Amino acid sequence: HGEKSQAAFMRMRTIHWYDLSWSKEKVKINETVEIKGKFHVFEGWPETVDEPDVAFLNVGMPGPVFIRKESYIGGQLVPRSVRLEIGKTYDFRVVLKARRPGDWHVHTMMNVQGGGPIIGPGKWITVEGSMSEFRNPVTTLTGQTVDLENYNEGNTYFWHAFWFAIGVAWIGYWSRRPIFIPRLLMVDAGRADELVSATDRKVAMGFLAATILIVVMAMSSANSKYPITIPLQAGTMRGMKPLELPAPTVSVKVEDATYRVPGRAMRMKLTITNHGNSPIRLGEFYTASVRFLDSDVYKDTTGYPEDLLAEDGLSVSDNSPLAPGETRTVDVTASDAAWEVYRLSDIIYDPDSRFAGLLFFFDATGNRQVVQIDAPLIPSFM
């Protein structure tokens, strides 16, 4: 939720989430679900989004219905912000632990500092159980196992209720006398200096004494009960390891890409050149969380979200195998209701009518090439 109101050219041209997995789609309380995958940072990053020099790998969910146990970019734990490089592919893994029962729409997202959230595809995951059984144990370096669901809760309640009671006693010492307008009349008509007794000054210096005294004795007792404390640990971790990929043996050039206004399909003319050693076929076009597949070439077996999966949404006009060294110009239609549901047709309202995406080519064996395409997208009305 939240992705359909973002700009369609911003969704097409920031992050490409592919190879995504979900270890479970139905889970119990205190049980973990893992989300692995790869994300590519697009080379033509938009100027209206700030560059991902301070990015945070986040999870989209309606509040903590799962807790994030772990996050890894590469194979390295990332509890802080990271610096990602434009053009690089990274490998991520997020381990979540189920907290609230229901049916939740979980996204993988990236929070960029001057660009907000970049939301990936979301899966409905069902949590069964009751929230009372949720435990969040952690073990401190001082040798103590606490439960983070209720740790430091009675202490917080005590120290806020105490100071609220002291403030209410300070107001209520002065609100047992006539509050408004014997005193308004007493100040301007002379006697403003008999509205305050000497007993009132005794009580005020008692409050000022045993407020500072209570604060310093409470700080001393907190320092004695918790001798070992560290600061809050923050800082952007640069030095993320990009996924090192072989160069693709397929080169694709987009001649022109159009789309009907209104409609549910976009069109492309592609010049495809196989510089490999095996015949390729085009099996998938991924543009902005939506996967258009050719059924004769590729079938999805990772349980992708069905609202974002066009399992026969790719129509290639000549999808015979492409021999090595052979070049072919071909017409490719990407057609699904998710074009209109996820508001990719709302690129007509964007000040930059260009698209980006990934094409997936498959050999006769099953070896996959990932080609990154990018072109102007021209609307069609007449």
Partner: protein
Amino acid sequence: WGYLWKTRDRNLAALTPREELRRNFTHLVWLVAYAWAIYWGASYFTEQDGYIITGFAAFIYAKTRLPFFAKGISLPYLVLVVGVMGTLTQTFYSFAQGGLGQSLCEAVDEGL
């Protein structure tokens, strides 16, 4: 605002102090309702994201039904409704016109 505005008291220059105190209490109930709507509109629902009617009706009621406010537009009580301490000082001085301020200034030696 139509039912409040056109129903202004014409002979406001000669009012009973008791009926003026009744209208002062009614205007203070209006200001209490405006304070409750200021609390509800701001302190709860801006932080769920984390009284124009009531205030202009109270301004109309003070301007029409009440002396001490018919001296023209009140500046703090305009800032309060188009933006309250100056409003309450003026409201208290409005209360201190009939007897309560030459009668309450004799209760200061018997009832503080």
